[PDB]
Coordinates of C-alpha atoms in Angstrom, one line a residue:
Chain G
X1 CA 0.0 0.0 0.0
X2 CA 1.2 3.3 -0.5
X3 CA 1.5 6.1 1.9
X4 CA -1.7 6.4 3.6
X5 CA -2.8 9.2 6.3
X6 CA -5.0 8.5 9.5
X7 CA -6.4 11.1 11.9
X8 CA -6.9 10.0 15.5
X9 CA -9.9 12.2 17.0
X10 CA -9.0 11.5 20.3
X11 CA -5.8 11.0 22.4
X12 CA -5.5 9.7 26.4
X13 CA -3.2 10.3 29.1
X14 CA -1.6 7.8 31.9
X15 CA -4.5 7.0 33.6
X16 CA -6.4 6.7 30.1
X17 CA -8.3 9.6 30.0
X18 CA -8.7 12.4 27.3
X19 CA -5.6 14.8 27.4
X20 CA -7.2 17.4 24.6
X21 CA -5.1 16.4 21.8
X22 CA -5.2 14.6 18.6
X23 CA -3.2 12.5 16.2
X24 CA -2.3 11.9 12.7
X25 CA -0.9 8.5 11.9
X26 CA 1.0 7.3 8.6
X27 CA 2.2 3.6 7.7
X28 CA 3.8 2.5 4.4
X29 CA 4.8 -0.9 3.6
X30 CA 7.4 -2.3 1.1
X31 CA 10.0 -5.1 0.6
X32 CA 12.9 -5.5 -1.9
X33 CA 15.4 -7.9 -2.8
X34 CA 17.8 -9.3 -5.5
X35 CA 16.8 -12.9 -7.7
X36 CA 20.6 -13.3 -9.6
X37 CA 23.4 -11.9 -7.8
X38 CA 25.6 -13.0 -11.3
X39 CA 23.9 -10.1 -13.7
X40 CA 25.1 -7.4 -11.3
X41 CA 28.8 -6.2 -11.4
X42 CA 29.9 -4.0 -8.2
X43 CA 33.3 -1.8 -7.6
X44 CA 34.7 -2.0 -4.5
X45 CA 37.7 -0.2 -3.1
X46 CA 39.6 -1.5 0.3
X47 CA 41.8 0.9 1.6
X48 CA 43.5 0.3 4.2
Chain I
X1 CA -34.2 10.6 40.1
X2 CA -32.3 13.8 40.6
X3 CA -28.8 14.6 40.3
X4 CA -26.3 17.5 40.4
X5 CA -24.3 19.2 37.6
X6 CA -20.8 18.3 36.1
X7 CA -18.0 19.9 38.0
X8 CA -15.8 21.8 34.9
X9 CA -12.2 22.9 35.4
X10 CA -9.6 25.1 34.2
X11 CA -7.0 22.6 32.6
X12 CA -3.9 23.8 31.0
X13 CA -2.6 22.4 27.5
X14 CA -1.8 18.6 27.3
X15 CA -4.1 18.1 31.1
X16 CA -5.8 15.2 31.4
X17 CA -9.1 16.0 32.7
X18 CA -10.5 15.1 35.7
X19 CA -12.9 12.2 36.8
X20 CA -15.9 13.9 36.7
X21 CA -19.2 11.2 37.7
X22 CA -22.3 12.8 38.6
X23 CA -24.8 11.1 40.9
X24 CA -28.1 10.3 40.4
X25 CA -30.5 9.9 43.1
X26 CA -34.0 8.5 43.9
X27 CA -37.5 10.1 45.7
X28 CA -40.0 7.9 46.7
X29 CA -43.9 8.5 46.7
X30 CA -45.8 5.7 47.9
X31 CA -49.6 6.5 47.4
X32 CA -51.9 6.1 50.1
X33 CA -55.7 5.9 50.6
X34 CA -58.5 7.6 51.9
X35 CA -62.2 6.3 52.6
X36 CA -65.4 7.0 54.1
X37 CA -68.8 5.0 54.6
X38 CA -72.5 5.4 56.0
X39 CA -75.1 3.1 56.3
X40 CA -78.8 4.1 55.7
X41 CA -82.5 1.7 56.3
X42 CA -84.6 0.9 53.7
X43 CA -87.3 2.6 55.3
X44 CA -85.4 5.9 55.8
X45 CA -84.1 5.5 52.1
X46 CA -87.9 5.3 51.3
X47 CA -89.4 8.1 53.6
X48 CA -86.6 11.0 53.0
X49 CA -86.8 12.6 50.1
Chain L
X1 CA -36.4 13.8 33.1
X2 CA -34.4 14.8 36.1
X3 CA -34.6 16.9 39.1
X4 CA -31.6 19.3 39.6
X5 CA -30.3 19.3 42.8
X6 CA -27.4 22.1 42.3
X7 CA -27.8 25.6 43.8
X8 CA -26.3 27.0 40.3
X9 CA -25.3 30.2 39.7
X10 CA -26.6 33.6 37.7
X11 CA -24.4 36.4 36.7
X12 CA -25.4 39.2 34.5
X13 CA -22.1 40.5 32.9
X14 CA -22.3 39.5 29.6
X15 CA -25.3 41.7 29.5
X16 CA -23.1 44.6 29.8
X17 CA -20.0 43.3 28.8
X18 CA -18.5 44.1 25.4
X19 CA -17.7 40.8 23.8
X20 CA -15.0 40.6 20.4
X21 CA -14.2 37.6 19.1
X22 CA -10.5 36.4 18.6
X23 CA -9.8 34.4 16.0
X24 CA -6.2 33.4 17.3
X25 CA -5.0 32.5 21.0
X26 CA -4.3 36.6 21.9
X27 CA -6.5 39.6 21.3
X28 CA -4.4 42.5 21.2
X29 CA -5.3 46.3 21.5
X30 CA -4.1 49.8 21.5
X31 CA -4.4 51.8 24.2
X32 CA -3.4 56.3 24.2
X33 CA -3.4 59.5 26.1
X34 CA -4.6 63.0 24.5
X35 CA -2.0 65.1 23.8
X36 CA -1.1 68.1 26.3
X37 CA -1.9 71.7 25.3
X38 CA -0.3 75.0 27.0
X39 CA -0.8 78.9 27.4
X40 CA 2.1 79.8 24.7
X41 CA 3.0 83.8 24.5
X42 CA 4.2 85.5 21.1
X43 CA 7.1 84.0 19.6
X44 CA 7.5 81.4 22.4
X45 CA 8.3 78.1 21.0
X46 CA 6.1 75.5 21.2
X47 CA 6.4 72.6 23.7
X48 CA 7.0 68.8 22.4
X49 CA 4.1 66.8 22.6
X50 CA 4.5 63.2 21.7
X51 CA 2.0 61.0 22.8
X52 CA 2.1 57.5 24.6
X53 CA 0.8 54.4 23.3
X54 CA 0.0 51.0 25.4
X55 CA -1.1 47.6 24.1
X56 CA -3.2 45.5 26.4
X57 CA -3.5 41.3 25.9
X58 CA -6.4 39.0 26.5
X59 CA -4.8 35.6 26.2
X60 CA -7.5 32.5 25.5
X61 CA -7.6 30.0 28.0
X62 CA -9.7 26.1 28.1
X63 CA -12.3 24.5 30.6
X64 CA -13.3 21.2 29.7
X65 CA -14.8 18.3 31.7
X66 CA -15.5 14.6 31.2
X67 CA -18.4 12.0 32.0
X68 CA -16.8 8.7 32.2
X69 CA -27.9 11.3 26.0
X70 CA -30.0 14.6 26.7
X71 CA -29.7 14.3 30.0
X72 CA -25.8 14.4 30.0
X73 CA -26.0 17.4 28.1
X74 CA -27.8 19.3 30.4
X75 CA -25.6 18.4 33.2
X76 CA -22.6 19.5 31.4
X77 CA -24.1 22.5 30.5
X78 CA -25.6 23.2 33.6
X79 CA -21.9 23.2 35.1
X80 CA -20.6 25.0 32.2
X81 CA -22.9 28.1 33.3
X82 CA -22.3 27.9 36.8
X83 CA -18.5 27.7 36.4
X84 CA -18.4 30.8 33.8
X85 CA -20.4 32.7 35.6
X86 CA -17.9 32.2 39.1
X87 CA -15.0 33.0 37.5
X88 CA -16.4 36.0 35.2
X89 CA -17.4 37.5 38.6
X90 CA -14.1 36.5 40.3
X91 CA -11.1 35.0 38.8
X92 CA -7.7 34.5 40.1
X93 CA -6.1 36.1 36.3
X94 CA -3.0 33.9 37.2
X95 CA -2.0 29.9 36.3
X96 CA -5.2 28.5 34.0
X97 CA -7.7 30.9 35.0
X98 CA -9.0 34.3 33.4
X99 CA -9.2 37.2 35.2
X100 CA -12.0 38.4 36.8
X101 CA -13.3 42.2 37.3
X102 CA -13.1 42.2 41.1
X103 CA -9.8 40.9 40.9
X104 CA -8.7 43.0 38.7
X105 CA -10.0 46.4 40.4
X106 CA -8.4 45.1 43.7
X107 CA -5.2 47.1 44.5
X108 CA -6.4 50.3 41.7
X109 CA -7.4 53.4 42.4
X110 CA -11.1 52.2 42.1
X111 CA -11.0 51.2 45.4
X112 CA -13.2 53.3 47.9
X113 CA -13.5 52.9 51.6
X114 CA -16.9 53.8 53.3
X115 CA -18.2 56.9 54.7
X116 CA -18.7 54.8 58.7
X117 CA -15.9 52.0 58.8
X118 CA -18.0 48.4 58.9
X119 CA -21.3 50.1 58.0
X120 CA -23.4 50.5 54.9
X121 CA -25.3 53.5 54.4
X122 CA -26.8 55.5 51.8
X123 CA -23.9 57.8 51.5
X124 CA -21.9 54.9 50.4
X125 CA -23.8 54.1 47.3
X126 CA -23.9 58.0 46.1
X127 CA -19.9 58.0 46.9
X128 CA -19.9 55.2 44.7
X129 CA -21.9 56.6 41.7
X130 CA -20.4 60.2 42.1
X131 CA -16.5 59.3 42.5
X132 CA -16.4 58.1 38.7
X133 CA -15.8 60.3 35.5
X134 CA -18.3 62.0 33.8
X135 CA -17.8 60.5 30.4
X136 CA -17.6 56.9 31.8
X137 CA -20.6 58.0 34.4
X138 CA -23.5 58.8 32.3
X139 CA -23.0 55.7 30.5
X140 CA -22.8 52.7 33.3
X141 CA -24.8 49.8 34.9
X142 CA -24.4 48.6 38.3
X143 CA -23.7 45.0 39.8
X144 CA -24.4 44.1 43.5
X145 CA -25.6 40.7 45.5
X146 CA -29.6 40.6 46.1
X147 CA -28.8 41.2 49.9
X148 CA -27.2 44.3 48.8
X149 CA -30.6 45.7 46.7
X150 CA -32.7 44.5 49.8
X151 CA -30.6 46.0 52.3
X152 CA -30.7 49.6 50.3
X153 CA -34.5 48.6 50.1
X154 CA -34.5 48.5 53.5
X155 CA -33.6 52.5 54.2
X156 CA -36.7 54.4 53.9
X157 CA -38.8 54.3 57.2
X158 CA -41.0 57.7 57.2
X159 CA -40.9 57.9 53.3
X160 CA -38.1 60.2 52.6
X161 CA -35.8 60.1 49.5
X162 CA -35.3 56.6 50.1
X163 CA -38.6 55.4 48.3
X164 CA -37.1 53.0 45.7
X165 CA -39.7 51.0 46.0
X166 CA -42.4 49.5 48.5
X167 CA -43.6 46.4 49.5
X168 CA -45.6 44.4 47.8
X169 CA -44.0 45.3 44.0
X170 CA -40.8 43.4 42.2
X171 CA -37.1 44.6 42.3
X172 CA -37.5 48.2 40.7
X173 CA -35.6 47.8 37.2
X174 CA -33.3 51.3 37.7
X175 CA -31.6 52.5 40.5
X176 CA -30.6 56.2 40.0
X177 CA -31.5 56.1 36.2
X178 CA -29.2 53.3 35.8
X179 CA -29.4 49.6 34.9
X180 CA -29.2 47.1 37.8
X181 CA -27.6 43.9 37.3
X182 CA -27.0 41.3 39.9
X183 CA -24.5 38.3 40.7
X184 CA -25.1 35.3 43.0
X185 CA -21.2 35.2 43.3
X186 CA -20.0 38.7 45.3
X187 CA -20.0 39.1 49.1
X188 CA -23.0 40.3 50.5
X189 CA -22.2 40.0 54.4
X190 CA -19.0 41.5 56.8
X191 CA -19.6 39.9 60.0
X192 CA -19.9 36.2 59.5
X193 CA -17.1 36.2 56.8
X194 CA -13.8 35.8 57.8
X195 CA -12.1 37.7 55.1
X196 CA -10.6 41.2 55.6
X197 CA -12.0 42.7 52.3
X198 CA -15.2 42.8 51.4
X199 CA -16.2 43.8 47.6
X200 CA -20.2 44.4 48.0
X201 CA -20.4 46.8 44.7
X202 CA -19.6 48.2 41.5
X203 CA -20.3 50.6 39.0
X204 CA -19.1 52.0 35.7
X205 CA -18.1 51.5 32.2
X206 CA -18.7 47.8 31.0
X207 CA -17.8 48.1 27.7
X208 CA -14.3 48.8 29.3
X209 CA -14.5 45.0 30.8
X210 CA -13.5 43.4 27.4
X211 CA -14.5 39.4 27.0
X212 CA -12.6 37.6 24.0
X213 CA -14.9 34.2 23.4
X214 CA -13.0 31.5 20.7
X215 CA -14.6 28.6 20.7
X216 CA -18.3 27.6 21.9
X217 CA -19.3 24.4 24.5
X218 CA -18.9 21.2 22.1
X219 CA -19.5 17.7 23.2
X220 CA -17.9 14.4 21.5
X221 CA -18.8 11.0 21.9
X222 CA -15.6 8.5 22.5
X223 CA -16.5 4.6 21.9
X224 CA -18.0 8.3 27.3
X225 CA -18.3 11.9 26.9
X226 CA -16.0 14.8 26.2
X227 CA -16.4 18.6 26.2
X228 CA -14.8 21.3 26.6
X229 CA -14.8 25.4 26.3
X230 CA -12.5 28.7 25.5
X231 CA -12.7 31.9 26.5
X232 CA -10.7 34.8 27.9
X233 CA -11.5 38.6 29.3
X234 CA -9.6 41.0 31.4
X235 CA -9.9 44.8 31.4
X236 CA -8.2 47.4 29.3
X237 CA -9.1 50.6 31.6
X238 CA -9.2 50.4 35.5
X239 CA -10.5 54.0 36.1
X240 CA -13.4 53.4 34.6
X241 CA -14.7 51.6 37.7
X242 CA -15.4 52.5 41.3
X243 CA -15.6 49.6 43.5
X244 CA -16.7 49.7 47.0
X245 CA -14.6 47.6 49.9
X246 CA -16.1 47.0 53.2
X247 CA -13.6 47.0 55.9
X248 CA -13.5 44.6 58.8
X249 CA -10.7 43.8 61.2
Chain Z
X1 CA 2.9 20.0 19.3
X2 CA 1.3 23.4 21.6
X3 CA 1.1 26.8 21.5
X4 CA 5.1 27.1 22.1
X5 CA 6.6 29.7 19.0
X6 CA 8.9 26.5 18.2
X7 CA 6.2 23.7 17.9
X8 CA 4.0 25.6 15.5
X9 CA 3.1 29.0 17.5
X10 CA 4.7 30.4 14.6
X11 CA 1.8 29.7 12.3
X12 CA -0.8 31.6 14.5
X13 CA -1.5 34.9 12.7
X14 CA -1.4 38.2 15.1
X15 CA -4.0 39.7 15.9
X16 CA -4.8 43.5 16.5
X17 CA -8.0 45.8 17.2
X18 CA -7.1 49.2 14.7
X19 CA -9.2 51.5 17.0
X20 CA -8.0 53.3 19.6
X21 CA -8.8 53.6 23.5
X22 CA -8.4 57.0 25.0
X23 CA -7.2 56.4 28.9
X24 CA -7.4 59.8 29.7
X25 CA -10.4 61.5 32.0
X26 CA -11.4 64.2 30.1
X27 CA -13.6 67.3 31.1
X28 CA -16.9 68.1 31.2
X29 CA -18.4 71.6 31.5
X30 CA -21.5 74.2 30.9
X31 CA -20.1 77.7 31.2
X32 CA -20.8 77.7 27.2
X33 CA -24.2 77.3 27.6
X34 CA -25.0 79.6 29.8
X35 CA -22.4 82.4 29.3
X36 CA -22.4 85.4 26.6
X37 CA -20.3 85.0 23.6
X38 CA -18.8 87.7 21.1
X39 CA -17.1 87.9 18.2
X40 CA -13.6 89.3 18.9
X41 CA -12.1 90.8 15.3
X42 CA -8.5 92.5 17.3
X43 CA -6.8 92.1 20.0
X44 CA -8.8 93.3 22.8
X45 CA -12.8 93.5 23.5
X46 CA -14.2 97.0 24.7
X47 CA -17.4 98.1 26.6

């Protein structure tokens, strides 16, 4: 899913009571990865 | 039932408020009875007008 | 339905108060002073007369309570009134709280000592209507506890120029060709109270008492019940008052 | 996020009344009512 915005009407304190504030909440989800490490070529420099 | 009013306050930014409960009470009013009787005779009930 | 068992409050300030509404958290104003004006002889040079300007501030604060349908509603509201009207009439002006007019006038010039120390008489209440300003007295209400308006009820015995009103007949709508208005929440007694001051009266120019309202009583619904209210007042000018302080020690 | 300048007070616009309050007493008087008045066209006003 992409980015996706959520408004929380209502927000509580310690003892789980309103404090008079709200919220806005965001979540994204994604994953990546690589199938054949072969057809890639990387350049790597080791100095020491 | 009765009751009594919400107690407000004067809370700053980012105060939790307070437990406010009201109460709610009960009256009671039993109903009661009243009566009243008199005997007449036939020949009374007859004569009087 | 329900039976309210609360004393409650009433207050009558906002009938005379002059109400603006603030769109952001401060009101802000501007405040001046004439400029001065002299005698000058031929080819005398003329004085510098810059004028002064002040800016007063009416910051917005919050009330707001919590039940943990109808029926709620009126209870919250119920305590809404009663609390706005308390703190209209008397607010401490510091922490979360706005100020309140007798607070305010506390510590000013406004405040008058009686004609007889620890008595109320009738000079006291033409001390109190003459001490003022002429422009801010012609145009002025008056605000007093209902003990107050019986006690000055209670004057005339023989029928004198004390004849407000008589028995028999409601509480006489002028006083002196003035509005009345009354408050449940002043002092109204010097001997049982334990305090040393005693504010029992006012009088002047309420559209000097300025009362910044933001945002309205609203109720929510969380699945209990949340509400909550703004507003803020102070006073821009404190000589346009004259506030009357029996003295007890 | 309050009220605080740094977490978003900045964005609050400011607010101002135009009109002006005057602080000052005044005076009130009715000499002009009831006094004579002339038109003076010198100096000095003879009789």
């Amino acid at each position: 899913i992409g980015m996706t915005v959520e408004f929380i009407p209502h927000l509580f304190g310690t003892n789980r009571r309103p404090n008079g504030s709200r919220g806005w909440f965001a979540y994204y989800r994604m994953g990546a990865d690589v199938v054949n490490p072969n057809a890639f070529r990387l350049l790597n420099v080791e100095t020491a | 039932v009765s009751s009594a009013a919400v107690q407000w306050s004067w809370d700053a930014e980012f105060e939790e408020v307070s437990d406010d409960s009201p109460e709610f009470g009960q009256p009671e009013i039993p109903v009661k009875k009243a009566q009243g009787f008199v005997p007449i005779s036939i020949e009374a009930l007859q004569d009087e007008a | 339905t329900v039976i309210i068992t609360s004393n409650g409050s009433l207050n009558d300030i906002r009938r005379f108060a002059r109400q603006v509404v603030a769109t952001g958290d401060v009101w802000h104003g501007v405040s001046s002073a004439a400029v001065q004006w002299s005698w000058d002889a031929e080819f005398e040079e003329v004085s510098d007369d810059s004028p002064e300007f002040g800016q007063p501030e009416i910051p917005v604060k919050k009330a707001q309570g919590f039940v943990p349908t109808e029926t709620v509603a009126l209870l919250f509201a119920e305590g809404k009134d009663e609390l706005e009207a308390v703190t209209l009439t008397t607010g401490t002006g510091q922490g979360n709280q706005p100020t309140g007019i007798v607070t305010a006038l506390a510590g000013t010039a406004a405040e008058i000592a009686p004609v007889t120390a620890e008595t109320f008489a009738l000079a006291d209440v033409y001390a109190v209507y003459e001490q003022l300003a002429a422009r801010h007295r012609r145009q002025g209400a008056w605000l007093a506890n209902n003990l107050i308006y019986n006690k000055i009820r209670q004057f005339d015995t023989q029928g004198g120029a004390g004849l407000w009103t008589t028995i028999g007949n409601g509480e006489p709508s002028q006083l002196l060709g003035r509005p009345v208005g009354e408050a449940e929440a002043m002092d109204a007694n010097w001997n049982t109270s334990a305090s040393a001051d005693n504010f029992v009266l006012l009088y002047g120019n309420f559209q000097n008492y300025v009362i910044a309202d933001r945002i309205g009583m609203t109720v929510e619904f969380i699945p209990g019940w949340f509400a909550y209210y703004r507003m803020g007042a102070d006073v821009v000018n404190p000589n346009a008052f004259r506030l009357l302080n029996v003295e007890t020690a | 996020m309050g009220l605080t300048k740094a977490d978003g007070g900045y964005l609050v616009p400011f607010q101002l009344d135009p009109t002006v309050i005057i602080t000052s007493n005044g005076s009130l008087n009715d000499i002009r009512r009831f006094a004579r008045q002339v038109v003076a066209t010198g100096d000095v006003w003879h009789g």
